[PDB]
Ligand binder design. Structure first.
Ligand SMILES: [Mg+2]
Ligand SMILES: [Mg+2]
Ligand SMILES: [Mg+2]
Ligand SMILES: [Mg+2]
Ligand SMILES: [Mg+2]
Ligand SMILES: [Mg+2]
Ligand SMILES: [Mg+2]
Ligand SMILES: [Mg+2]
Ligand SMILES: [Mg+2]
Ligand SMILES: [Mg+2]
Ligand SMILES: [Mg+2]
Ligand SMILES: [Mg+2]
Ligand SMILES: [Mg+2]
Ligand SMILES: [Mg+2]
Lengths: 116, 70, 151
RNA sequence: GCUUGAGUCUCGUAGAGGGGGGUAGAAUUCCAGGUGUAGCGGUGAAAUGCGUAGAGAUCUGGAGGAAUACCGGUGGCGAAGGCGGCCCCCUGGACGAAGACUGACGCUCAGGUGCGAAAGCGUGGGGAGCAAACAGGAUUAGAUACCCUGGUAGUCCACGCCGUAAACGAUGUCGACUUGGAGGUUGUGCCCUUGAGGCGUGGCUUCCGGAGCUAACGCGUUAAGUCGACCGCCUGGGGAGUACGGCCGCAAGGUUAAAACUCAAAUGAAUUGACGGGGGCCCGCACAAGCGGUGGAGCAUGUGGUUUAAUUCGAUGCAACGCG
C-alpha cells in the first residue's frame, strides 16, 4: 500500500547471519527477510548464497509497495556483503547509490576477551 | 566508503568500484581487528615482530642477489 | 595414482551394432568375466525394448541414457568436526559411465523373471522417465542443490 | 694560581615529560516513541538466553560512563615505573651556535630519604563496556577448565596505604682510548636553494659486521674490547627465600634470614639422532574412483582355552595362528 517509489535497502551482514530490510527514505520498514529464516539453519546461513536468497525474498514482500529505486546501505563484515547487493539488481531494482555504514569506534568501548 | 552511481553506467562497474573504495578504507580489517581485546603487551610484541621480518626479509633478498644458483 | 597420467584403453565395438557406447554397456553389465552370456542379455533386452516401443535399437538405448545421466554431483570433503559435500561438475566421459552403472545396478533390484527382462523394463522406464535408475539421478541432483552454498 | 672537568648567563629547536581545568566526534549500552513482521543470538555442532506481552532490523529524541580510529613510524619524551584526541593555566629536563663568567666547586656512595606497573586495602563518589567469584547450557569416562549465554568485586575519580613484577638491553654509575657500512630522528655552518642540490659538524636511536673477548651462543665506538674510581651481590642441588626473632603494614603480606636432614650431582651453550596434535617437497592399492571378498551359515584346517594317563615340542603384534 501507499505506493512507495524510492526505498532504501539495509543489509545487516554479519559473521553468522544476514538480515535484509527494505525501508523507505524516512526509515520506516516495509518488509524484511533474513538468511537463517530461509531454510538455511546451521552452518549454511553464514554462506554468501544463503544471503542471496534473503535478498530475493526481501525483494518480494514489498511487491505491493512497488518500489523502483533502491539505495544499498551495507553494514558489518560477512559473506553476505556482496552477494546480497547483486541479488537486489537481479531482482529488478535500480541501485541509485551504495553507501557503507559500519560502527567503527575511535577507540571507544572495550571489546570482549580473546577466544582460546 | 560511500559510492554514488553515475549516469550512463553499468552496474557491475559500480560494484567493483565499491569494493575498491572499501578495500582502500580498510573497513573489514578494522572490524576484524576490533573483535577481541589485544593486550598492550601483545600489541607491542606483534608490532616489533612484524618489523623484524620486514627488515630481515629485505636484507635476505640482498644477500641472495649476489649469488648464482646454477 | 599420484604421479602418472594414464591414457584410456581401447574397447572393441560390439558385433551386432558396431557401437562402442554399447560395448561398454555389455562390459559393465557382465559379471564374472563371461561376455558371451552378458552380450545375450544386452541383445535380448534391446530387441524387447525396440519391439515394445520407440524406433530402432540404438536410439532406444540412447534415450534411456539421457534421462539418467548426472550433470552435477557432490564430492565429500572434511573440514572440522563433521564432513562437507562440495558439488562438482561431471566430465562427459564420467557422465556416461555413471549412467550405465546406475541402469544396471537398478535393474538387478527389480522383481521380474530374467535379467534380460528386468533390463528391458528399466530402459523402458528410463526413456519414459520412471523407475529407480532415474530416481537416483534426481537424488544426486538434490544433494548437489541442497549443498549449493558449498560450491 | 690555570681552564682542557663541572656549573651560570644571552638566542632558538623538538617532544604521548608532569599537575589542574574545559571541550569535540565516532561507537557500545539503556530509556521514551514510529514502521514492521517471525524469528534473533551463538557454535566445530548445539543448547541455555531474547521474541507473538511482539524481539532482531530500521528512524527520531534523550541520559550516562570510559577510551581517544586515521596520523602512528625496531618514531619521541622521562632516572625507572611510564606517557597517544583538541585547547588554556602552572611547571621539570635535554640539545645546538657564537660569545661572556665562576675557577676543581668533581665521581661513586653503606645507613638514610624519595619516586615505584598491575593486583590488593580504607573512606566517599561513579558504574556504559569488559570481567575474577557465581549461575546455567554444552564438551567429556569425569571437566568444580578451555567453548556459549548472563554476571558481582574490580576496572573510573579524590585522598591515604601497600612497595612487589620475566620492575628485562636477565647487562650498576662515571671517565678515557680502540678499523667500518647502511638507516631513523633533531639542531647547525659553508657554497652554483642558482634545479626535488653538494660538502661538514653536534645530541639521541635501530640494524650488520672487523680486531679483540667469550665455554659456546654471541658482544662488537651505545662492548660482553683495552683501562681507572666507587658501590651492590655470588660460593654445589633440595630443604628454602622457608621456620623462629626484629622492623614495617589496617590486612594481604614485605624486608633481614638460618638449621637438622638429604643427593652426587643440579646447571649453561653447542653436537648427532629420534620425536611433534611444527613447516615445506616427493613417493607407495595410502587414500580418492571402481570390482570382488572377510565379519553372519555349514564344513576343512591352524591356534588359544578347558579336558585328559598323554592330549609331544616349537612359532605366538605388523614380521605367530592351511606356520616347522
Ligand atoms: Mg563471543
Ligand atoms: Mg649518584
Ligand atoms: Mg640503601
Ligand atoms: Mg590500581
Ligand atoms: Mg577501591
Ligand atoms: Mg566503594
Ligand atoms: Mg625482586
Ligand atoms: Mg617493563
Ligand atoms: Mg635482575
Ligand atoms: Mg653485532
Ligand atoms: Mg617470608
Ligand atoms: Mg618474619
Ligand atoms: Mg563364517
Ligand atoms: Mg601346540
Amino acid at each position: 500500500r501507499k505506493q512507495v517509489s524510492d526505498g532504501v535497502a539495509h543489509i545487516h551482514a554479519s559473521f553468522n547471519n544476514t538480515i535484509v530490510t527494505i525501508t523507505d527514505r524516512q526509515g520506516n520498514a516495509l518488509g524484511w527477510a533474513t538468511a537463517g529464516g530461509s531454510g538455511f539453519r546451521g552452518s549454511r546461513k553464514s554462506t554468501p548464497f544463503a544471503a542471496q536468497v534473503a535478498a530475493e525474498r526481501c525483494a518480494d514482500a514489498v511487491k505491493e509497495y512497488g518500489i523502483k529505486n533502491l539505495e544499498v546501505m551495507v553494514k558489518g563484515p560477512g559473506p553476505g556483503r556482496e552477494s546480497t547487493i547483486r541479488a537486489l539488481n537481479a531482482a529488478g531494482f535500480r541501485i541509485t547509490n551504495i553507501t557503507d555504514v559500519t560502527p567503527i569506534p575511535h577507540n571507544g568501548c572495550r571489546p570482549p576477551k580473546k577466544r582460546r | 566508503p560511500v559510492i554514488k552511481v553515475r549516469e550512463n553506467e553499468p552496474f557491475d562497474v559500480a560494484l567493483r568500484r565499491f569494493k575498491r573504495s572499501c578495500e582502500k578504507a580498510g573497513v573489514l580489517a578494522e572490524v576484524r581487528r576490533r573483535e577481541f581485546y589485544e593486550k598492550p603487551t601483545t600489541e607491542r610484541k606483534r608490532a616489533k615482530a612484524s618489523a623484524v621480518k620486514r627488515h630481515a626479509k629485505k636484507l635476505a633478498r640482498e644477500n641472495a642477489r649476489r649469488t648464482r644458483l646454477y | 595414482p599420484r604421479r602418472r597420467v594414464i591414457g584410456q584403453r581401447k574397447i572393441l565395438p560390439d558385433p551386432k551394432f558396431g557401437s562402442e557406447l554399447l560395448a561398454k554397456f555389455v562390459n559393465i553389465l557382465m559379471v564374472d568375466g563371461k561376455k558371451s552370456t552378458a552380450e545375450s542379455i544386452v541383445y535380448s533386452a534391446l530387441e524387447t525394448l525396440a519391439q515394445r516401443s520407440g524406433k530402432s535399437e540404438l536410439e532406444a538405448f540412447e534415450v534411456a541414457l539421457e534421462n539418467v545421466r548426472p550433470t552435477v554431483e557432490v564430492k565429500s570433503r572434511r573440514v572440522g568436526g563433521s564432513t562437507y559435500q562440495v558439488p562438482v561438475e561431471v566430465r562427459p566421459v564420467r557422465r556416461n559411465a555413471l549412467a550405465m552403472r546406475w541402469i544396471v545396478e537398478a535393474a538387478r533390484k527389480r522383481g521380474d523373471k530374467s535379467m534380460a527382462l528386468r533390463l528391458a523394463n528399466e530402459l523402458s522406464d528410463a526413456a519414459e522417465n520412471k523407475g529407480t535408475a532415474v530416481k537416483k539421478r534426481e537424488d544426486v541432483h538434490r544433494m548437489a542443490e541442497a549443498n549449493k552454498a558449498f560450491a
